[PDB]
Design an enzyme around this catalytic site. Sequence first.
Site, PDB file in Angstrom:
ATOM      1  N   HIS B 104      52.747  18.809 116.739  1.00  0.00           N
ATOM      2  CA  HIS B 104      53.163  17.651 117.435  1.00  0.00           C
ATOM      3  C   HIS B 104      52.174  16.946 118.105  1.00  0.00           C
ATOM      4  CE1 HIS B 104      56.857  19.142 117.098  1.00  0.00           C
ATOM      5  NE2 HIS B 104      57.169  18.545 117.229  1.00  0.00           N
ATOM      6  N   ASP B 205      36.330  63.173 105.266  1.00  0.00           N
ATOM      7  CA  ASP B 205      36.862  63.551 104.232  1.00  0.00           C
ATOM      8  C   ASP B 205      35.655  63.110 103.385  1.00  0.00           C
ATOM      9  OD1 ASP B 205      39.441  62.671 102.203  1.00  0.00           O
ATOM     10  OD2 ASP B 205      37.773  64.330 101.934  1.00  0.00           O
ATOM     11  N   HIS B 208      36.632  64.687  99.334  1.00  0.00           N
ATOM     12  CA  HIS B 208      36.734  64.725  98.502  1.00  0.00           C
ATOM     13  C   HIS B 208      35.669  63.859  97.377  1.00  0.00           C
ATOM     14  CE1 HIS B 208      36.011  60.463 100.350  1.00  0.00           C
ATOM     15  NE2 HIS B 208      36.339  59.985  98.962  1.00  0.00           N
ATOM     16  N   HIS B 213      35.156  60.479  93.151  1.00  0.00           N
ATOM     17  CA  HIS B 213      34.322  60.079  93.120  1.00  0.00           C
ATOM     18  C   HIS B 213      33.419  61.062  92.119  1.00  0.00           C
ATOM     19  CE1 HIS B 213      34.866  56.752  96.062  1.00  0.00           C
ATOM     20  NE2 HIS B 213      34.837  58.072  97.057  1.00  0.00           N
ATOM     21  N   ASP B 362      39.672  55.334  94.933  1.00  0.00           N
ATOM     22  CA  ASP B 362      39.990  55.880  95.890  1.00  0.00           C
ATOM     23  C   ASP B 362      41.991  55.389  96.044  1.00  0.00           C
ATOM     24  OD1 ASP B 362      37.273  55.693  98.005  1.00  0.00           O
ATOM     25  OD2 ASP B 362      38.114  57.157  97.847  1.00  0.00           O
TER      26      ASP B 362
HETATM   27  C1  LIG Z   1      30.200  59.539 101.657  1.00  0.00           C
HETATM   28  C2  LIG Z   1      30.913  60.733 102.412  1.00  0.00           C
HETATM   29  C3  LIG Z   1      32.311  60.399 102.921  1.00  0.00           C
HETATM   30  C4  LIG Z   1      32.723  59.979 102.953  1.00  0.00           C
HETATM   31  N1  LIG Z   1      34.106  59.682 103.669  1.00  0.00           N
HETATM   32  C5  LIG Z   1      34.130  58.303 103.152  1.00  0.00           C
HETATM   33  C6  LIG Z   1      33.388  57.364 101.937  1.00  0.00           C
HETATM   34  C7  LIG Z   1      32.636  58.830 101.990  1.00  0.00           C
HETATM   35  C8  LIG Z   1      31.519  58.295 101.702  1.00  0.00           C
HETATM   36  S1  FES Z   2      52.333  20.362 118.895  1.00  0.00           S
HETATM   37 FE1  FES Z   2      54.575  21.005 118.441  1.00  0.00          FE
HETATM   38  S2  FES Z   2      54.454  23.292 117.566  1.00  0.00           S
HETATM   39 FE2  FES Z   2      52.058  22.754 118.023  1.00  0.00          FE
HETATM   40 FE   LIG Z   3      35.994  57.820  98.843  1.00  0.00          FE
END
Ligand SMILES: c1ccc2[nH]ccc2c1
Ligand code: FES
Ligand SMILES: [Fe+3]
Lengths: 447, 447, 447, 193, 193, 193
Positions: B104, B205, B208, B213, B362
């Site tokens: 509107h 982490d 991992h 990786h 991942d």
């Molecule tokens: C390096 C060390 C820890 C990490 N955790 C997630 C990515 C990553 C890279």
């Molecule tokens: S001007 Fe009516 S919904 Fe935005």
């Molecule tokens: Fe990772």
Amino acid sequence: MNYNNKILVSESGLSQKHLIHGDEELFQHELKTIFARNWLFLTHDSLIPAPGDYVTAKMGIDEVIVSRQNDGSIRAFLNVCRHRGKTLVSVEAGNAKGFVCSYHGWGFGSNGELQSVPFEKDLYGESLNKKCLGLKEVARVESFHGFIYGCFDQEAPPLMDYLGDAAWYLEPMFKHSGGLELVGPPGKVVIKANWKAPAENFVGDAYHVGWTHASSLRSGESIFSSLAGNAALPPEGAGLQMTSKYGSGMGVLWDGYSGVHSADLVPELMAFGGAKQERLNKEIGDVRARIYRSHLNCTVFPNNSMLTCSGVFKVWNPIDANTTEVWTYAIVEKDMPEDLKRRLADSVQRTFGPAGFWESDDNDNMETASQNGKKYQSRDSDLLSNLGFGEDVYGDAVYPGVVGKSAIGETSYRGFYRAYQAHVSSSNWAEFEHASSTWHTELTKTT
Amino acid sequence: MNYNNKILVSESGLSQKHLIHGDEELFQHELKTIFARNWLFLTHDSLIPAPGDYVTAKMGIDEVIVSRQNDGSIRAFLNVCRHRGKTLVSVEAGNAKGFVCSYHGWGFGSNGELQSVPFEKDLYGESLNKKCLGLKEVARVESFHGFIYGCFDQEAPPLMDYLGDAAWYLEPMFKHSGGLELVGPPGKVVIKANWKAPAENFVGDAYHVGWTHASSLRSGESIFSSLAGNAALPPEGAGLQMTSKYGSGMGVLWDGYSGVHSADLVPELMAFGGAKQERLNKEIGDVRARIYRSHLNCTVFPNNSMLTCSGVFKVWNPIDANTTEVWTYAIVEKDMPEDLKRRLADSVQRTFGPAGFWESDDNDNMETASQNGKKYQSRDSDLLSNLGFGEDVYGDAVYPGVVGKSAIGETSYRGFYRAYQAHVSSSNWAEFEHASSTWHTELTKTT
Amino acid sequence: MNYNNKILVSESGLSQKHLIHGDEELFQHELKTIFARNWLFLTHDSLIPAPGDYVTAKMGIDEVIVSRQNDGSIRAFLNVCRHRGKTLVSVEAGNAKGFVCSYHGWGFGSNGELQSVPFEKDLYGESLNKKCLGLKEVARVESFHGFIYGCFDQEAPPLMDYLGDAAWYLEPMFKHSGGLELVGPPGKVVIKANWKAPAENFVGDAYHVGWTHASSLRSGESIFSSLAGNAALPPEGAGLQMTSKYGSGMGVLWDGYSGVHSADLVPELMAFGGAKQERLNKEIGDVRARIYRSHLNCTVFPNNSMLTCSGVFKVWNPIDANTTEVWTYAIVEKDMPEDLKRRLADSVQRTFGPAGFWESDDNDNMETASQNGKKYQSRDSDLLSNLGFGEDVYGDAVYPGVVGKSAIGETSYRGFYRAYQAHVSSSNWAEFEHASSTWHTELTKTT
Amino acid sequence: MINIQEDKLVSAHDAEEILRFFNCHDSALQQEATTLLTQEAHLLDIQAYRAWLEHCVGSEVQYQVISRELRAASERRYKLNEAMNVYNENFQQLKVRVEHQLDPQNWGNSPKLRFTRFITNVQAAMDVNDKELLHIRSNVILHRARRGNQVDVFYAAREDKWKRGEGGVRKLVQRFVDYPERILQTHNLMVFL
Amino acid sequence: MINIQEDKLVSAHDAEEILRFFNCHDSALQQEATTLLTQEAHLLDIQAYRAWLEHCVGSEVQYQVISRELRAASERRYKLNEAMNVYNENFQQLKVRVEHQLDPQNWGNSPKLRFTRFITNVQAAMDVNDKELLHIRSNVILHRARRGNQVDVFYAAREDKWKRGEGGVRKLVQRFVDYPERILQTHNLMVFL
Amino acid sequence: MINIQEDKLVSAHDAEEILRFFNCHDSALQQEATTLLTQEAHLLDIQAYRAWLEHCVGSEVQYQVISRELRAASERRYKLNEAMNVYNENFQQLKVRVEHQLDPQNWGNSPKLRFTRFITNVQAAMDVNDKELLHIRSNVILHRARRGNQVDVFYAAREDKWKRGEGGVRKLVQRFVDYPERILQTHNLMVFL
Ligand SMILES: c1ccc2[nH]ccc2c1
Ligand code: FES
Ligand SMILES: [Fe+3]
Ligand SMILES: c1ccc2[nH]ccc2c1
Ligand SMILES: c1ccc2[nH]ccc2c1
Ligand code: FES
Ligand code: FES
Ligand SMILES: [Fe+3]
Ligand SMILES: [Fe+3]
């Protein structure tokens, strides 16, 4: 959520919680209190004229078979076999004396009766009570000038009473014109919006036309054009808004008989409508003959909408809180030359069908307003519908219903949402009537 | 589920029920107790530097507009029109003095105020109270060295206090380097994982890295390589882990300033970081200047993560319990030569963006761990985070927070999940503080 | 819904509420009371014959690893790492001595034991109690002539007792033939049906064959053909139906050893089955040797179905109330010439696999009956299973179980749904036994 | 052919690319470009990534896939970086990605992935200034399936430059893709378009 | 080639269209039709709608996309309108739709949409009676993306008539599409197929 | 061209198929194969299954679509059946499937289904030993729609052998598809790829 007590719609329909367009528990509750209780559009006489003709239609999320009986009446049944529940009919329209299930072969008549069961003597002997195994029948099926509506609730007011004060405005075009025909098949498209988003827009939203449809009006080559981009506000006295006890309402834009149709149809339509209005002045009076050739944007509660004159006819079939299946038909006057009927039907689909360039302007508005009702910080926010509040009247000498004597406002939103509130917080029709015994007084406060 | 009593996280953050990554009722409850209560990343000064510049950002499932005001401050508003709730802004970034709704035509300033309504005099007269119709504003917006965070809860600790003990570790790179810039646009991809799966991985982490990786390290041609396939455990004293009262935490891998960048960037980066560290020794001391050029893998509670030095900056935007939209930006030091900025930005996206070959390693880990939280026999199973438990300290003379003086462990998972538990079982910030009055004692048991 | 009291299945299994095929809360409740309590098909000895061979299988929505141990036994474990819950095995079958997680590298033996953790000495020292960190083991794993079933509930009757009276009918083909082999890999396809729709069809539906499969029978060139389009009702005495206490049941079509196989296999199969029946007459008697070469359409409660002779073997793996993943294997007699095994396996897939032309006839029946259970007006409707009621016997001198001495009826539906009712309203095996202490009396009323 | 003052939605870049193909049409070149791209897409579909690098990719390649931020059609003031680089690879960087695909410890490649590529709308035109260089435009639908029920489908237009090389071995020297979907719903974009 | 009394699923219309292409095959015409359709699909993909109208669309065009109601295969009595028209446009009506796309106040075109079109299965045959006219059949996959995460993919077969025009500028005089999906799940059909 | 000891992800079968096409390229054969496959896909799309059998399928055909079990990339011990057959049809079995499609009581074919097929990446090479035989490779996207809102899309590469036959009527003698999705999410695979 306790639907007896939760204020989803504020007093006088002034605002609604934004969650009503996104909450799935409310959608399930609307299946019971809105869709299984109110009158829903099914079909038109013109689409099932002869004995045996049928169509399938949705009523809320349920699918029904709608069939012309041998005696000329119409009956409608759930499209579900009484044996193990398979869907009986897989087509959209046809002509038949009965429907046979593809699972075990049970055969039902056009009248819903269980007529034959394969090898019934050898298998069931005399045990099967076929008289109690007819298809589940829609309790109420009634016509408004050829437009057929159904209701699962035996207790609903008759359809004419349910239309209330809106019926007076529809009669010039639906009755006094000589009758309308519905041109099929409909276009069918899914949108990611709640059913109420398009219903509220068609019931009472003239404010959005100049801005939402700026490109369609400007490109379009229609009579409501000059509004493109809000470059002009319509003349004082250019229309009115109305609403009614059971929720139906509309806007009236005086004399806009060519509606949204581009310039290619303008002259012929302005010429047909004005000739019929001259004949109608003698029969129904000047005001009502003018209403005939005036553009009405209407919603017949809950989810059937139309634009008279433009000839757009919609069903907003609910699928879930943010999904709606949109059915689009064309309505034409039966006494219009055939060639003009065909062109008007294409024009309806050109502007508001599946590839309708005007309807596409509304997509993002309807989808995002509905989807934002699910977002955490918006659920308890208030959607506003206060434009025109305190200037609405009831019981006028010339125009019936709760009426806002201005072309642009939110009168019809307030009436729609007052009725919606009264249904969602009621367990039956009697409770709705008790909740609606001062309906027009609530809507006319401040006036 | 009763969130006051249910033990989703066991004492000392030692284990978590697997259902926390799959339960949709818990996700809805996190919208209130995690996302509407804590500080969430929005943007950086470098992406909206001039008056009128804006971006859109998610805060939980809500979308907000974040705009640079004429006075130099930043304000953020829900991206939802105050009339009928349409989404106001459909782009990701721009420069404007205001936002006009396409439904509107209401026009809101960059300051959120309702500035104009089409045909306001003719339609609303003087009835519309525009002063009460500004966009819903994010209560709290604060900066940490150019990084802009928002919080919907007026009661939250200031952002600097909320970072707690993690702030000391971020300051060398965020403040003492001369400042960082955020390079846009982000990459944006949906993953079928809970938001907590990537947040826990970045907060704590290191275990991992060698196995998950192995192919990226071996192919990659980076400095942390020799770990490929767990062929070598990092030297004694190669890093540490830390966590804090409000949930933020990180791992510190000493001197790994080139991070995950392949061999093509190693020499230039090792040369830039070591030169700035020599200057910083005089200003902030040898330990803190070493932290500047040491790789930090950090999560700023709840869902913002980063790898300093590598320059990866992430937002884990929640969609549902097994869906997250991942936003990936690059962070660069403002005083690095332009050409090196450009190459580092591409390198961030090469390794961790939409087609990032390290981030792709991942995917299956994050998605399947999250989806298994929905499986019947796993919902009530316990995810383990006990590595290093009983060897963590608090209040050390050199390194602040709850600290595990070992490069690989689960110290930071325990701190993240202790804070998460205390939020999900609390109704407000005061209750979280009461539930956290012995936070470090709980995390250092057995030590 | 209160599952102790709600009558989902009426007395004597005569009708079921249509909502049982669509209600998602009931599906979640079936995960506990049906899938975590009853015996579910896993694999066959022929698919994991040697030490180290494994396959993955679903048990309800859970995935398990099923592995042949060095001592010749089979053990099955959840396919979920005990550390942070990643899915351990991503393939469908193989041979290994253990499974290593791709997230942090934990290594589990084929016996489920946690055997190795990367850098366990440096990281966990002696803290990690690996003896308590084996994979979550399926409590019960038993064989029926090489067919391996699992059950998460230690309290379940032994598999042979659970098969009840159905075991007597399966033994001719499963045991006295010399043994069956399962031919892999299965076909795997998702259908939009509830798991109970195909289970009920295979347990007891001979009525649908002539009508549903009219085109497959007519095109097909099989021995049950003349039934195409219900053009003929099978001879008096052409078969029987049976059901049992714990829900398993089947139909018996006398002598239809070629089953659904087209005319190209008819002669060779009729010749192999009749030769083995002649040898079996001396060993197990004429009635049981006839059952061997008679077509059985059976469901082993809950969701394993088969067509003996045709050699179709199915698992209906539940995903949600209207989604099932269909696994299709072939079963062949081990002493059939290799070339005939290969052709029979292709024939099974030709007729009932992913592109099975007979199975495709059932799709719309199964999907629409299931999806109509969600529709508002059908949820509380009654699916009928009364054909043959009052003519069923129990304790017959020649055929055991609750038996309907007619080829076409609904005896087996009533037994399946009586057992389903007794499980959904029970909290454990003892309560099911108490609810089933007059199981056969309830099914034989009116007789 | 295009006037971008009149055709208001068309970018200057796109109008230049149309001009390149509507003028000098050589049917033989179009057929040759079709064969080249079908062979490249077969090598990729069977995951012969080393063979792809050796046979199809030039030493001077720039392999670039961008993702453009969504900005207002009327924007004219905000002038910060318009797009990030999903890929912006030289030959050595492509080689690193190929070694990553082929490494035995790339756990996500077990069970083997399945790729199917559909190359359409091929157009080819020689460069005006460097006659070693052919401009080739083509659209790709790429289907990547794995792990039973993961299916991802990618859609894109490719603006390539290929050089003659030696021995009839035409090799890619530039691939530019402006990826059409801003937020990816394919888990990652870890495929060679 | 087809006998529709034997091939029970085939419509009379479809059997006539097959007859048109299996007889006189001109390989040169097929290649020319392929170029024409690839150029048209490039103009549309870059949203050069005015250039499309000017270069590709004849003044006498009928541009028609129908949606057929689902009826029983054995139906023979119900004889009401079999299909509505999603599009049934003359040149002026196409011009209105192009002006609507290009208008600055078409709010749904901000951020700019992204289109990718894939044209396959091209067949071409000259009309028997009018030698200005070429019948071209082709199938299209159309991908339309916008607003970060909205992706719609359209699939259709196109029965076209193109006329020679002047100066080598072949122009569409009829496009007929019988859209295969009855209920659209793409939000709208607001794309030029 | 491929060394599968170096290109570690490539199967011996796939490396043999690449060798077949990169050597002897005949542009005329490629165009002929493109026409053949476009005509076959038109007959199938209009559901002229008898005409397809009569015009396109040889009496000695093997029409085979497999589904391979997901196994570890390093697997070398487990040696049980690697794949089932979704299709493994001779001419008579194809005829049974065509009669099933055409039967009036095939209830799932009412309302009539709608098929659209997209054939790309066509390559053709003559067999070295049998000069009646042409190897044709092509990829297909198949869209099958029905019942208002059911849409299934299939993706696959096809390894075909076609023989000259008589009168210019080339006919399929072998179709081999290794279907790329292990778990089908299209309700069934009841389509002719
Ligand atoms: C390096 C060390 C820890 C990490 N955790 C997630 C990515 C990553 C890279
Ligand atoms: S001007 Fe009516 S919904 Fe935005
Ligand atoms: Fe990772
Ligand atoms: C004209 C006037 C009002 C309207 N509301 C919805 C469409 C429309 C058209
Ligand atoms: C023959 C007889 C009964 C049956 N029920 C399901 C398949 C089937 C085949
Ligand atoms: S479900 Fe209809 S006849 Fe059985
Ligand atoms: S989740 Fe398996 S080793 Fe960590
Ligand atoms: Fe509108
Ligand atoms: Fe069946």
